[PDB]
Symmetry: C4
Subunit: 280 residues, 4 copies
């Protein structure tokens, strides 16, 4: 199987309030809403019971009634204060002091969690479906390409092309090792349209003299990581992708995406790869 | 035409709620306000209809009246609760529980979007109108300069001078390639007033022995990117600019901006470039 | 004793509102809550006294009563406004203008402090209990390992292995010096499961020809720092750890954690270290 | 005079709502409060006038009275809604819809500006009062030192020592140039107590064979920049300082600050510099 999925995430399987902030960001929206709606009603229900424990302390409430106690809580906590249900004495007015404070502080935090979850940036970067190993500038070169899917530019953009493969030590240790493949240009200070990433395969490159045969044997994989500062979000963005030997087009050439000055960019041609065809 | 505009942005033309966070930051203020004002009234209108669906559940409302239902919603959602229009029974008080929560959470988020849009930092950096190619320290050197337009300093400031030009491969591939021009000083840990950026043209420089003639031929362009941590905003800032061959003053020398100790800085002289004039 | 504790923090002992923001983040939750609850009641108590200083300016209050004045403040500050206690005249309505503003601005800030304290990211990274000095790729190599304790990946992850030891200058100055040990791979662009960090001990390494004997003599310590961008938090995370000579297993080999494709990762084996046993 | 003050800021003198976000962060607290208090009253005053323009639309208001109109605004904007002054008809209830929204959005933003200004981190770093040029490891070395003034550590801490001095080009151009002095250790991944920063003066150092005489002549200055990630704030912090020739103690040696294991750190000795005294 694939050690790395095509989105860069790993295949491998792993083996209450300890990691609260992580879980409140990663848990699904249905759970998250429920969880907030849970705390909301539970806190009002606990405050209501305290109002009833004081005695008949809500001006137009039914004596010993939770419903009335509960709704007087949501009016105090939300700071609506219609004025039909109003507190009586020092205990009911102290609890109001405490509940108005709980309500103001608490909900403000729940809403910044909602915002945190909602204001997540995404690098609108599109990775080419395949990689090509063709001769460029008199040297076989491993290539792939990225494109921005938005008008806005990406500042100090850098890319990492990593070979991940099985190896055998000088002693006899069989381990998977990551190689960070040296690229002609790893940083593009302003990435706005398209970028073909090239790794010239030389006597220093870990894939020197390596054929499709030998790449499949070491179960070689190529993991790509793009990172850059987005202008639209004014935040740093990241994007990642992973390829296998089945996703390398030996001899393939990427088709030009820039048309016509009046210059254009067709993202149809983005995954288009040219190839010479030998005689049958 | 110009591949890069003078502000660094590219010329080239590209070819509902999928990219919500990006669009809510990039859409214009008139659209943004409308969009928030839209949701505001639409949510109150949907809550109003639910109050009417329960029956005569608003204490001083006209029966079957939306206006009354609607304004009781904006008083509940905004948590004003005047007390003339007050809820009756369990359904109207449940909807209030839900609407007070919707109103508190929702508006808090809309206001942090307003803040996000409003609290954007700008590197108050001014790029010189032209570049000069003059002999400095016994070597022709490509220069340009930046100035800070505020009192506050910029920490860990770095600049990238990138040559972008048409090239032909050893095979015959005609492609545009970016060169990151090596500068005498790419980082200024504390940038506060002015910085002349120099690229000494040597046998390693991509513009070695290159004249205005040959630079226009490869439709050469120079893209500059400034980045640094601003003290005033306590955030990182960035600024960018682009030049063409028409914006290079061969033999030009930048005029000194620092006057008189009692030292000064005249930003008039900032774009002023000295030049020798040959006999006619 | 240990110059560095096992969590990386130093042993050494050091020798009102000057550092407010730091202290409001570092002070304990019991102090922090008290401090907020303090300001809350103190501000309402100061506003109450001003209402009493105006005269009988609260519609259904007992004349000269602080309790009534105080609760009318918490209803104004929290913006509950039940309507039983309502202001009378220009002074009571001006103070309301001022208190509603104080209450809105103040509590909003107290809640973002609560959020700041609550939304702290933690690199769920587990450092191996020991380090090993075994021959890997025909060179004795100092190793240790890290593991991620969450599904979510860590982007642009880097690790620093620092030797900290007593030294004597060419003059005769006895000082403690930190060496940043060169690692085969200091950056893992995508760290998701496990990473064995290796420092090949060569004629350039500060621990060349160094035995347990000589390492204890210079009271050598090894400090590890992990840093990376977390996907779950969408923030940068950091983690650190420190070892002594008693925590180095000479000849030790880390046990493989990756089982079986159907690949797994047992974190039991994570601290497991294999060792050859000489004949007695 | 001093080109750079001792806090790193430059001496040199420079020569409505264009830079709003910068000015709202840099303007003084008295101006800032006034500015917010300004907008607050001005917005309520503009809303009041609109309520009066509708006619007698406030239930218990005096007809044609601004005071009453104004206070009904602050009760609507702050969302207090006591209920004595309540809106009448569609125009007064529409304006309430608009003002409750203006009040909720507006104040939320004003409070995040208050927070932004208040939650500024400071690197509690103390720079030594002087620098020393003494022989360390058989080479004259320019040194200075930093200390942390808090328990909490500073992660990925880096320091820049920059020589700033007057120079003359191979042509005859007299310019001030910054040299970034190469340090034995520019990065301390974990800075918690003290760090002596050393620049070994070698045939590559810009201050090679340079005496106090020649350093004063080129009006040499030394600018130091410290940057690092603070644990307490969970943010990056920075600190800077500048020295002149009058602040260099030729032959000086920094006194040890670490006492006694039971290790200590006396910050009294921090500025203490030892010196040999020649015979008179
Ligand atoms: Cl916020
Ligand atoms: Cl925030
Ligand atoms: K309210
Ligand atoms: K409110
Ligand atoms: K109310
Ligand atoms: K209210
Ligand atoms: K009311």
């Amino acid at each position: 199987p694939r050690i790395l999925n095509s989105d860069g995430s790993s295949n491998i399987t792993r083996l209450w309030l300890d990691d609260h902030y992580h879980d409140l960001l990663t848990v699904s929206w249905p759970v998250f809403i429920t969880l907030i709606t849970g705390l909301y009603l539970v806190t009002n229900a606990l405050f209501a019971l305290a109002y009833l424990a004081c005695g008949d302390v809500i001006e137009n409430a039914r004596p010993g009634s939770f419903t009335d106690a509960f709704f007087f809580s949501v009016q105090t906590m939300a700071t609506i204060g219609y004025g039909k249900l109003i507190p009586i004495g020092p205990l009911a007015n102290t609890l109001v002091t405490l509940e108005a404070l709980c309500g103001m502080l608490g909900l403000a935090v729940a809403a910044r969690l909602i915002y945190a979850r909602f204001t997540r940036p995404t690098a609108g970067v599109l990775f080419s479906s395949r990689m090509v190993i063709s001769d460029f500038e008199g040297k076989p070169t491993l290539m792939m390409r990225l494109a921005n899917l938005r008008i806005e530019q990406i500042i100090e953009a850098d890319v990492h092309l990593v070979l991940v493969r099985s190896e055998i030590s000088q002693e006899g240790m069989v381990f998977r090792r990551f190689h960070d493949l040296t690229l002609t240009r790893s940083r593009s200070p302003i990435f706005s349209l398209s970028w073909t990433v090239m790794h010239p395969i030389d006597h220093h490159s870990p894939i020197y003299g390596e054929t499709d045969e030998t790449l499949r044997n070491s179960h070689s994989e190529f993991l790509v990581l793009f990172t850059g500062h987005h202008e639209a979000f004014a935040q740093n963005v990241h994007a990642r992708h992973a390829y296998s030997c089945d996703e390398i087009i030996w001899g393939g050439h990427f088709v030009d995406v820039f048309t016509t000055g009046r210059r254009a960019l067709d993202l149809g041609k983005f995954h288009e790869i040219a190839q010479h065809h030998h005689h049958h």
